Design a protein around this ligand. Structure first.
Ligand code: SPH
Ligand code: SPH
Lengths: 193, 245, 297, 245, 297
């Protein structure tokens, strides 16, 4: 397990901390969206920060998928339900909570859960990249994961308003990396005496 | 089934943890059900799955000025709701149900609800002077939506039936004091062996807050109410119309 | 070749058990001890007790038979038939010598319950019912004086046409059963079987050869004036012409073999119409006689 | 199945009687088929029935000036045809087929057809000067419709492949002289274990009249051609997209 | 609880049989009589005959071994490998001292078959194939004179970046295998494994890290000039500067372990482009050399 950044909005130095966790405060609580992302390990964004993406940056046959984990930091008296849904590849993200409810999904809660481990399936149908030359094909797509406010964030009078959900990342013993290729980076400064 | 399929979220607004609250009476899906008989040249069939999972329609909010809400069946099984892909084609329908109601609140709130299922719940409308003996039964009221509809006069149940004697039907007492769970099972209830996909609406679900919701200022002023259902043993068949292909 | 199959929805284990016939109760239980009996010992006052069991002179001994009352009367006047005991005056058909009510002798009537609000109240505690029926007919002058005259009764099954005039051949017919009796004779006791097209009485689409139910597009629940074609009645005065005396006929309906299903809360509002239980939504009333305060009576 | 379901008609334009013409080689539905393997985080499922019956798309007419027609798969399984209710949602597809071709004519007509199934039949278009190396493969030609499309130059097969050596693929000779039946079975043919619902079109069906149709004046000038198919062992699964509910 | 289930699609009976190992043929058949042998007896002329059987010196006796030819040569030069026997000159990379073709020493080349139309014709009789590969390299001056110089070869796996300039660090790398040899040394024999991402060679969406296949919306099958990123090659001249001699390098590809699937009719039109088998739809030609008449040759 390695913690995963999703709220990767800040780009300064002091505010570097909250790249890791995101708020679940109680302003709107019926049908809006929290955050979405992709499932591409070694391209950009979230998985680039964990160790799985770092190891994916050394091969060509990757998955960047499978189980994740969410740990809640509500004080002790916070209740509420979150909707977690996964969209298979080659599909649009649902425009409402009802559409996302269909397919595959799970309803979280804050009573006594403090954890949840959704798992991603693995499917291979199309051709990743069959470029005989570069600059002619730009056809890439992947499934997505979304978080929906099911119910508003209940709280007794006296407890704080904003909490923070953290996210984890891991895999299991099904998928493997392949085709050892040389990694290309910019982790240099030229002046290395 | 399980807890996942398309909808995988298992955490509502309070984002609760520490197991679940069900309190089972029966022994883990007590067997299948019957097929009955008929008296005509018609015969139905079964759709098996894709209706065997769970469903969670929209959450209605409880406030101090609340009066209560009701639902009609199988109105929410149709396109008026999440489903609607195998509900408006066929002609015959029959199913059991596994209805589960989950509420949530802190330890500082007070109030108590009441769930009840009334078979053949035919509303007598608001009435009060709208003189109608038999001209045209309404469709804009008896089928409000998957959201339900707030009651007008709960004491007379908006039909003239007293609320006091409601507990004759199966019922549970949603009490904010101790628990938050409500699991009920409703078998098929109809005079005819099989029902239609039309204005022969089956039982209706009633939820009335008897003990009013109250609290102190500064806390959360609204308590959400979740509704889940599971259509045990459903069927779908029957169709014949104009030009076919 | 086949790759998909899933039904489940089953449970295995203690489904059923042995087959016996032992309809006699036996001594059950005895006693069990808990703790020190005290009033304000700290946790809860007003503690409990238990017994063993006995069932009249059948179970256990029969040495002494000391019932509460020395056999006053019967103790089962509570069944469904017991409830539906009397036969109320439902129909009050009136035949004048001349006038506007029934000038041409004929008089059409149909079975219903809304004629008596009390009867409707008593009968609408349930949803589904299944009962037989009986009828008795008494004819008298308004001053109550028997006269020599012959009468014709006939039952009309659902969906049959309506005899309007005395000259209507529907009076003749062959399929509609008819009854002939002089009024000086004793009343005409008769029975009517279970005529519903389903396993219980319930309206909506049940009448008319055409369609029905809610949201009409292909049918009217009017059928002219006789709405909801169902079991009705007809009555004439036997004769090629009018009669010589005024008549006041009466009906007496009586259920028999009554079976109910699915009880529901009775009613707490005044009835308004037929086949549409509306209420005074602006004149809603309480139920019991309210008192002044709660602390005092 | 059987011969009835929704479509119950069993009499075409000639309204023929006296049994049927099939000429079976195999032993009455020779068993099920496999499931294969995969190398990713995806896995399909099965729809069982509602695709197990027969289907009869539109009848194309044979005339003296005919040139031949072709079809693409599973283009006709989609909404482009009778089906289309369980074809555009999922992602994976694979099935066998039971294709039956039934023609009909009097004893005074002459001519002979040729049926053949060409796997991975990628058309090279009309070409002839339309210089295209790799810019944009067409969609208005490779997916004409459930009616098929008349060929331009059958001798070169509108792709540059000679028609003479066609019989390498499975084929039957529709001969107006003696019989009128044509039953063929095509198993799943694809490099990858499972196909997509997109531009990875499977085998294509070819019908070319080699012996020209001819007759004498006064008789029927057009001979109809029936097409029937039966999707043995089909599957459907796979879906993930934008906002879900 | 469960009411629907149906798969079928099965057949029962004579599926399989006994397990033996008897790879030796035996006398089969003999004779059977039909009718009176005549020429124009009325129904059909030119009647038939039959034999029994024998298989070389293995089956039946081995008393005399009289083959058709007294062991001239081998009789199996028809297999797939036999067909794909030679190694044709596929690559003809040319390196001048100065000019416009390859001024900066570097020269990029990629594997393909359209370089030889005859090779493409021979290889496109099937749909699916699976074979290994080998390569040999010969370097000579245009006048054919060996010179003292060192060369650098390297293979580039699919999806790897393109080394454009001599100063590109991709020349250095660590993951791209490289080969160093002086040209005076014997040629550089080498092998290449099966690098396809599926079980057979077939284009469409197989290249580029991005999308592909037909009807592009998210990808270009261009990748600049190197379309269809796949197994390519690179070659430099070893040195911090230019070289002193012109060079003419050559390639020799050779299949090995060849397996085909799904034969198709070969071709009857001239090739036009790459990855798009168009044809001269207005200049369609016949196939064989047509003669004048049919009655005569
Ligand atoms: C169309 C009239 C009723 C409209 C619906 C209101 C309530 C629906 C259920 C009760 C009405 C039909 C079921 C039978 C009730 C009474 O027992 C019957 N009248 C028996 O005579
Ligand atoms: C995108 C280029 C081909 C376009 C489709 C035309 C025909 C499709 C099937 C043949 C092309 C791919 C299958 C392999 C054919 C040849 O054997 C390969 N080039 C082997 O090198």
């Amino acid at each position: 397990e390695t913690i995963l950044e999703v709220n990767n909005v800040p780009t300064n130095a002091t505010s570097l901390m909250e790249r890791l966790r995101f708020p679940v405060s109680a302003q709107a609580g019926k049908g809006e969206l929290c955050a979405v992302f992709r499932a591409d390990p070694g391209r950009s964004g979230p998985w680039q920060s964990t160790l799985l993406g770092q190891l994916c940056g050394y091969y060509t046959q990757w998955s960047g998928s499978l189980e994740v984990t969410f740990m809640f930091t509500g004080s002790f008296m916070a209740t509420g339900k979150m909707l977690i849904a996964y969209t298979p590849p080659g599909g649009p993200l649902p425009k409402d909570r009802a559409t996302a409810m269909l397919g595959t999904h799970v309803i979280w809660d804050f009573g006594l859960q403090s954890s949840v481990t959704l798992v991603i399936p693995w499917i291979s149908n199309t051709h990743y990249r069959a470029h005989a030359r570069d600059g002619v094909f730009d056809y890439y797509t992947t499934g997505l994961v979304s978080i929906w406010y099911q119910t508003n964030y209940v709280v007794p009078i006296g407890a704080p308003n904003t909490a923070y959900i953290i996210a984890l990342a891991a895999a299991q013993k099904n998928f493997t990396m392949k085709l050892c290729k040389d990694a290309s980076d910019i982790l240099q400064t030229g002046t290395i005496q | 089934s399980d807890r996942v399929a398309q909808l995988t979220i298992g955490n509502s607004t309070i984002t609760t943890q520490e197991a679940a609250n069900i309190i089972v009476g029966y022994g883990e899906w007590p067997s299948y059900c019957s097929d009955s008989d008929a008296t005509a040249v018609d015969k139905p069939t079964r759709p098996d799955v894709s209706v065997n999972r769970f469903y969670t329609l929209d959450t209605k909010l409880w406030e101090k000025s609340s009066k209560g809400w009701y639902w009609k069946f199988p109105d929410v099984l149709t396109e008026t709701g999440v489903f609607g892909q195998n509900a408006q084609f066929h002609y015959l329908y029959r199913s059991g149900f596994c209805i589960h109601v989950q509420c949530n609140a802190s330890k500082f709130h007070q109030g108590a609800l009441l769930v009840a299922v009334l078979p053949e719940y035919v509303i007598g409308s608001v009435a009060g002077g709208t003189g109608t003996e038999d001209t045209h039964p309404p469709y804009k009221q008896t089928q409000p939506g998957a959201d339900g509809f707030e009651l007008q006069h709960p004491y007379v149940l908006d039909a003239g039936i007293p609320i006091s004697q409601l507990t004759v039907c199966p019922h549970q007492w949603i009490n904010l004091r101790t628990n938050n769970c409500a699991t009920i099972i409703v078998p098929y209830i109809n005079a005819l062996p099989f029902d239609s996909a039309l204005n022969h609406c089956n039982f209706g679900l009633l939820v009335v807050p008897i003990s009013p919701l109250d609290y102190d200022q500064g806390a959360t002023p609204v308590i959400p109410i979740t509704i889940t259902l599971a259509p045990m043993c459903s069927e779908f068949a029957g169709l014949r119309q104009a030009v076919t292909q | 070749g086949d790759r998909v199959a899933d039904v489940i929805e089953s449970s295995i284990g203690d489904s059923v058990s042995r087959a016996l016939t032992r309809a006699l109760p036996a001594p059950t239980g005895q006693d069990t001890q808990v703790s020190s009996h005290r009033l304000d010992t700290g946790k809860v006052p007003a503690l409990q007790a238990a017994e063993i069991g006995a069932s009249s002179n059948a179970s256990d001994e029969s040495m002494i038979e000391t019932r509460c009352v020395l056999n006053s009367h019967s103790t089962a006047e509570t069944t469904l038939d017991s409830f539906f005991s009397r036969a109320g005056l439902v129909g009050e058909i009136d035949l004048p010598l001349e006038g506007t009510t029934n000038p041409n002798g004929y008089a059409n009537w149909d079975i219903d319950i809304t004629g008596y609000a009390q009867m409707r109240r008593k009968v609408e505690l349930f949803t589904y019912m299944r009962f037989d029926a009986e009828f008795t007919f008494v004819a008298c002058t308004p001053t109550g004086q028997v006269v020599p005259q012959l009468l014709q009764y006939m039952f009309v099954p659902p969906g049959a046409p309506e005899p309007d005039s005395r000259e209507s051949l529907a009076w003749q017919t062959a399929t509609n059963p008819s009854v002939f009796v002089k009024l000086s004779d004793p009343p005409a006791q008769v029975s009517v079987p279970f005529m519903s097209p389903a396993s219980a009485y319930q309206w909506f689409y049940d009448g008319y050869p055409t369609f029905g139910e809610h949201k009409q597009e292909k049918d009217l629940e009017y059928g002219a004036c006789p709405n909801n074609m169902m079991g009705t009645f007809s009555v004439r005065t036997v004769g090629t012409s009018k009669s010589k005396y005024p008549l006041v006929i009466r009906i007496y309906m009586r259920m028999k073999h009554v079976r109910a299903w699915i009880p529901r809360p009775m009613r707490n509002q005044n009835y308004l119409f037929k086949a549409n239980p509306n209420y005074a939504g602006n004149f809603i009333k309480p139920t019991g006689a309210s008192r002044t305060a709660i602390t005092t009576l």
